[PDB]
Amino acid sequence: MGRILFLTTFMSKGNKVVRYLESLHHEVVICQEKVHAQSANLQEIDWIVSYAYGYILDKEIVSRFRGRIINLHPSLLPWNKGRDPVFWSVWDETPKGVTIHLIDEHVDTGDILVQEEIAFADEDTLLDCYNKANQAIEELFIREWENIVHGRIAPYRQTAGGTLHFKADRDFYKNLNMTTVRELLALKRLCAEPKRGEKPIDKTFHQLFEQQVEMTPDHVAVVDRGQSLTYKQLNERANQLAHHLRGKGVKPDDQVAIMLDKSLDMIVSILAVMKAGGAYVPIDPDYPGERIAYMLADSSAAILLTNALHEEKANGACDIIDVHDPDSYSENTNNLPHVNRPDDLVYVMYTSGSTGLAKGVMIEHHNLVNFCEWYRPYFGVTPADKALVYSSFSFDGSALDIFTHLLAGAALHIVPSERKYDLDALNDYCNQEGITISYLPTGAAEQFMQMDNQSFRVVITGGDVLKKIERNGTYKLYNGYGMTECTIMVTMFEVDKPYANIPIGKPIDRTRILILDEALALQPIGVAGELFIVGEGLGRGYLNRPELTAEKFIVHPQTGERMYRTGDRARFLPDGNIEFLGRLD
Numbered sequence: 001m002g003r004i005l006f007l008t009t010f011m012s013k014g015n016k017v018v019r020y021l022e023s024l025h026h027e028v029v030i031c032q033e034k035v036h037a038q039s040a041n042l043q044e045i046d047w048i049v050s051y052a053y054g055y056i057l058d059k060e061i062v063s064r065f066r067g068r069i070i071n072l073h074p075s076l077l078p079w080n081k082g083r084d085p086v087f088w089s090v091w092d093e094t095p096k097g098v099t100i101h102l103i104d105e106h107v108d109t110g111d112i113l114v115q116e117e118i119a120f121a122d123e124d125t126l127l128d129c130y131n132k133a134n135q136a137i138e139e140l141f142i143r144e145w146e147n148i149v150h151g152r153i154a155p156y157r158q159t160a161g162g163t164l165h166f167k168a169d170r171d172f173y174k175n176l177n178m179t180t181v182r183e184l185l186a187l188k189r190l191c192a193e194p195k196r197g198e199k200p201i202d203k204t205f206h207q208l209f210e211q212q213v214e215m216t217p218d219h220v221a222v223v224d225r226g227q228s229l230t231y232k233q234l235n236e237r238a239n240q241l242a243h244h245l246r247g248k249g250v251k252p253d254d255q256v257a258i259m260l261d262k263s264l265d266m267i268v269s270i271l272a273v274m275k276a277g278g279a280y281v282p283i284d285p286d287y288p289g290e291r292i293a294y295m296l297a298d299s300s301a302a303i304l305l306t307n308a309l310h311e312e313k314a315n316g317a318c319d320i321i322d323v324h325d326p327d328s329y330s331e332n333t334n335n336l337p338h339v340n341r342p343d344d345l346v347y348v349m350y351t352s353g354s355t356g357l358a359k360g361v362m363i364e365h366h367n368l369v370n371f372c373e374w375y376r377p378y379f380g381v382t383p384a385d386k387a388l389v390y391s392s393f394s395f396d397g398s399a400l401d402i403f404t405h406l407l408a409g410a411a412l413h414i415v416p417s418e419r420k421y422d423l424d425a426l427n428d429y430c431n432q433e434g435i436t437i438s439y440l441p442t443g444a445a446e447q448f449m450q451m452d453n454q455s456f457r458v459v460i461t462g463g464d465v466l467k468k469i470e471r472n473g474t475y476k477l478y479n480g481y482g483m484t485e486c487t488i489m490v491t492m493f494e495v496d497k498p499y500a501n502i503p504i505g506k507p508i509d510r511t512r513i514l515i516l517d518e519a520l521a522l523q524p525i526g527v528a529g530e531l532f533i534v535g536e537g538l539g540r541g542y543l544n545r546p547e548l549t550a551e552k553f554i555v556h557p558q559t560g561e562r563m564y565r566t567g568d569r570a571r572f573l574p575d576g577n578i579e580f581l582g583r584l585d
């Protein structure tokens with residue numbers, strides 16, 4: 001009949017298409033490589049049929065064979081042009097079908113000959129989809145071939161729009177081939193990029209705090225033993241000190257060290273540093289003098305807010321400002337002119353030097369603002385609540401204590417030394433004062449479940465594996481995961497039942513968790529892998545450690561996004577909650 005060139009790389013040589021064409025007495029030449037005009041495979045060729053051909057025909061060839069190049073593309077063109085059509089058909093959630101079209105001067109854009117719809121079952125695998133489509137289009141070709149040879153089909157131009165994909169676009173999804181349709185789309189919801197319409201955070205913390213002061217100025221803000229400050233009182237005193245600081249040269253991104261024991265002066269100092277424009281570097285005064293001397297040096301802190309008691313532990317490291325000297329406070333009680341942006345430093349905390357020397361973790365305002373903006377509505381915090389300043393102010397767990405509740409109008413209650421380790425005593429305080437919400441490390445939180453409590457409405461815990469769930473009170477328990485580098489915490493779970501492994505929940509606001517293999521490629525739901533963090537949580541990095549910063553804050557090779565690699569193992573559950581599975585090594 002005629003000699004037909006059959007171009008293809010992925011399909012076999014005994015296709016139902018080739019056999020059918022052969023059955024009509026056509027000599028079918030099978031070529032699976034790029035060719036040129038001189039190729040002996042283009043000799044006496046009546047028709048060219050391409051089917052999953054991974055190369056481009058030269059324009060010289062397309063011109064000579066105009067109207068005689070027929071392509072089998074398993075998609076509903078213009079949807080899913082290019083490579084991996086069936087896969088992106090499912091992922092991008094586009095219309096589905098198979099198209100037999102003419103080949104023109106571009107990628108899968110030529111006019112259509114025949115096209116029909118196709119359906120994939122929710123429980124079909126992507127491989128099943130790939131095969132169901134290849135079989136459908138092969139049958140369509142056999143059915144409509146005669147109509148195409150006699151050129152009685154009027155080719156119609158493709159609808160406007162569609163999508164296009166390239167060979168490498170599927171690299172990130174290389175492990176999803178044996179996944180189910182609905183199992184794949186589930187993974188899409190959990191890990192797909194942010195939706196449209198989002199705007200960057202436009203507020204700093206002290207900006208929002210000054211707002212909260214105007215709303216609840218006379219409400220109690222912080223308590224320590226018998227003494228207390230209201231939102232206005234606290235705000236005015238912090239301004240007085242902030243004015244003095246900014247007058248001593250404090251500028252945005254400057255680090256100011258604070259060295260105090262838990263007290264009202266600590267809260268004033270922290271805010272005062274913020275309002276002045278700097279970022280506070282907390283230094284526990286009980287730390288060994290070695291750590292203190294090193295923290296003060298590695299940090300660029302030119303100023304140190306401290307007592308006269310702990311003044312000598314600096315060994316003259318920097319300019320001292322006595323929080324108890326009236327000369328350290330200005331007359332001006334008014335808020336200062338704003339000079340910060342959400343991407344300015346807000347605080348710098350050092351991780352315990354378990355491995356190697358301690359590193360200074362930088363955190364920006366937008367990092368802290370996002371956490372508090374999520375914390376308030378998630379736990380329904382109102383000015384009626386009262387929370388504990390439990391954790392050492394050198395740990396990011398203290399940021400949860402102080403900063404979240406202050407923006408909700410609640411009241412902070414400083415936890416002194418005598419009721420830090422003695423949790424039974426701390427329990428009585430909570431019932432006395434009516435403490436309603438606080439965060440307790442996994443350890444202390446587990447012991448506190450023994451005590452009888454009627455005050456707490458909610459308690460949050462995290463930092464280690466939360467094995468024990470039984471507790472006497474009536475309050476909700478929450479498990480939270482995260483590290484200092486991504487601001488306090490990134491996921492939250494409400495503990496409703498007991499669990500063998502207790503999940504760490506779903507991501508907070510404007511954060512995304514990805515479970516990746518050793519090649520940084522997505523892992524299907526239920527498969528373990530290194531947990532990666534993306535979004536508003538990621539801080540600036542490690543202070544004066546750019547090489548180490550780049551090691552942990554990566555630019556992904558495929559999606560090009562900035563992610564923090566935790567070094568933790570985890571796996572998604574079918575209901576969206578995350579399961580922690582210990583460290584990597």
Ligand SMILES: Nc1ncnc2c1ncn2[C@@H]1O[C@H](COP(=O)(O)CP(=O)(O)OP(=O)(O)O)[C@@H](O)[C@H]1O
Pocket residue numbers: 351352354461462463464465466479480481482483484504566568580
């Ligand atoms: N709810 C949780 N369950 C289990 N592991 C958790 C967890 N929350 C956090 N983790 C893990 O345990 C660590 C606790 O946080 P960080 O104290 O900031 C790290 P570190 O200071 O290097 O060591 P450390 O955990 O020995 O204190 C996190 O880095 C994380 O890997």
Ligand SMILES: CC(C)C(=O)C(=O)O
Pocket residue numbers: 395396397398400462463480481482483484488489
């Ligand atoms: C201190 C709190 C926020 C914590 O879970 C952590 O840092 O791991």
